[PDB]
Design a protein around this ligand. Structure first.
Ligand code: HEM
Ligand code: HEM
Ligand code: HEM
Ligand code: HEM
Lengths: 141, 146, 146, 141
């Protein structure tokens, strides 16, 4: 998919994320809900303002799916196919929201890994997240 | 932009800690590396062929500083962004013909650079206020296109 | 929007020939078929599972007609679009939370449908004026987001 | 790349375009220049206002490249690779401009083939043009 150099950078960067993938996934969602209020409509108000358990669970799943993707960069459509059916076919998530989440994920990585989030790594992660987004929005039917 | 009095104070307090040269150079550098078509507008800066060349380029730092200074003017004039950026809108739209999508891209890069420098102090709530600020600036710069 | 007196007259002359029901039904139908995530907002219309179902759906036609009528109000109030669409902006932004990108998408679909119906009379120059009109409407509808 | 159904629709629709591909390519460019003035910066003023030969030549090349793409839907990156080097690496064409041209191309098809430009065909062509655009913006280095 990506270039060999990007693949190398992404695998490397994700090794530094390690066990924090789910925590970063949850924080990225929070950043997204507050920064981009239109994204809140897919979720119960209670889960966004009076709780955190369901957001954290979606956060862990986001983190796990990205970890899976990093291990299958040569075949993203095959590793993430099922998630497109859910997000596009069933829930009809507007594609713009994957761009918003991607920005919030990069923001979250910059906060926690300031020394590892170099310009070259930033560029490769951006391309990775755009490829994941492309797969997630591939099947609206 | 639509900012509460509490958000506005939080936005201004963070700006007191912003080194416009350091943050500015880094924001412009990242734009050039992550979204390389933007390099079309900065030929005079010299070698932009790889990340090390870009981030260390003194012209990138000097121009980034000017860009950040102008963001600072916006942060201190949140109630009159269109007027604050009128002349810059003329330049970017009528002389350079920069597509407005790139204004948003730069705004988002700036937010990522603030996050990198401030770490946990750049909370989800403060990022939210900054997203409204950068959207506001992008829209004011795009005004002469409409 | 920025329209010359000659462009404005050309824009209004074409609108006299626009059947709001026919064009409206087709524009909304195509939006639903080409950009299927938009279907999330129109569950009440019934079966939208395939193109034939969508284009023949009487609820799609009736709502498309209302959408086009509202575009017509904009075309006849080119100097006060924000004011003409204020209440609709409230509805779309505060109640429905429609992402503004979809306003642009619908505007572009409308232009393609005008092209289909008017053929060679929909010249490159007239399309240009219509692109300024649909951008203007999209921006006015997105006003309550900023 | 696209789904089997889209591939079928695109091959079919392009057979109706036939020998008009270059003429449609030139008209789509004209529509784009007038409708979206920022796109004019990549070209000499003279070619846009006092002539038409160079626009027509770019138009024919656009049409030929789309015809080539339709015959190689399974491997677009391989058929169009060289054009990405030119448009992205050498000329640094802003990616947004491929979206603008795509819209203008759909507009041009609707003008000339009103009875063949059905909703289903519109949807498949949109996906095709988006895939071509993705390839053309794949190599900024
Ligand atoms: C990298 C991007 C994303 C990934 C990998 C991802 C992953 C997932 C996963 C693994 C699930 C749970 C599937 C299950 O076990 O039932 C899920 C559910 C869901 N996702 Fe996402 N998601 C992403 C982005 C988004 C976005 C941007 C939104 C909307 C703004 C969204 C909205 C939802 C919703 C509404 C559910 C259903 C929750 C539930 O039923 O409890 N997702 N996602
Ligand atoms: C949206 C935030 C932006 C702000 C606040 C900003 C601000 C500025 C400022 C303060 C100047 C100096 C004006 C002068 O020369 O007198 C300038 C010039 C310039 N800007 Fe921007 N800018 C922004 C985005 C962009 C982007 C996205 C591009 C293109 C990718 C761009 C390209 C340029 C160029 C080429 C110059 C002339 C400098 C030279 O000749 O080397 N700007 N801008
Ligand atoms: C940008 C051009 C658009 C215009 C001029 C427009 C105009 C209108 C008008 C006149 C109404 C009727 C208001 C009423 O119920 O009193 C309406 C309602 C509505 N609009 Fe739009 N609209 C636009 C785009 C969109 C798009 C992009 C979406 C979402 C994909 C959308 C979703 C809706 C929905 C769900 C309703 C309520 C109708 C119902 O409850 O069935 N609109 N709009
Ligand atoms: C489907 C999309 C497009 C295709 C298939 C396409 C194809 C081509 C081809 C085949 C060439 C000539 C290569 C050669 O023989 O030297 C060319 C040149 C060029 N294209 Fe495109 N093009 C597309 C879109 C665009 C866009 C959107 C722009 C800018 C708005 C653009 C700007 C240019 C420029 C500036 C040249 C150089 C002209 C010259 O040197 O005479 N192209 N393109």
């Amino acid at each position: 998919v990506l270039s060999a150099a990007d693949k190398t950078n992404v695998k490397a960067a994700w090794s530094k994320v390690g066990g924090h993938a789910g925590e970063y996934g949850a924080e990225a969602l929070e950043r997204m809900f507050l920064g981009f209020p239109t994204t809140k409509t897919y979720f119960p108000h209670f889960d966004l303002s009076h709780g955190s358990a369901q957001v954290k669970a979606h956060g862990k799943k986001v983190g796990d799916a990205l970890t899976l993707a990093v291990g299958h960069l040569d075949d993203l459509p095959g590793a993430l196919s099922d998630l497109s059916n859910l997000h596009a076919h069933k829930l009809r998530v507007d594609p713009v929201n994957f761009k918003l989440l991607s920005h919030c994920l990069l923001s979250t990585l910059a906060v926690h890994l300031p020394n590892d989030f170099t310009p070259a790594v930033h560029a490769s992660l951006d391309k990775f997240l755009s490829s994941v987004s492309t797969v997630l929005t591939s099947k609206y039917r | 932009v639509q900012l509460s009095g509490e958000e506005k104070a939080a936005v201004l307090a963070l700006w007191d800690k912003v080194n416009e040269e350091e943050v500015g150079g880094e924001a412009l550098g990242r734009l050039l590396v992550v979204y390389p078509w933007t390099q079309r507008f900065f030929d005079s800066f010299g070698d932009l062929s790889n990340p090390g060349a870009v981030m260390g380029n003194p012209k990138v730092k000097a121009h980034g500083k000017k860009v950040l200074h102008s963001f600072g003017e916006g942060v201190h004039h949140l109630d009159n962004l269109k007027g604050t950026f009128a002349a810059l809108s003329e330049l970017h739209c009528d002389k350079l013909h920069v597509d407005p999508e790139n204004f948003r891209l730069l705004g988002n890069v700036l937010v990522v650079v603030l996050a990198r420098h401030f770490g946990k102090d750049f909370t989800p709530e403060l990022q939210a206020s900054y997203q409204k600020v950068v959207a506001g600036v992008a829209n004011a710069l795009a005004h002469k296109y409409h």
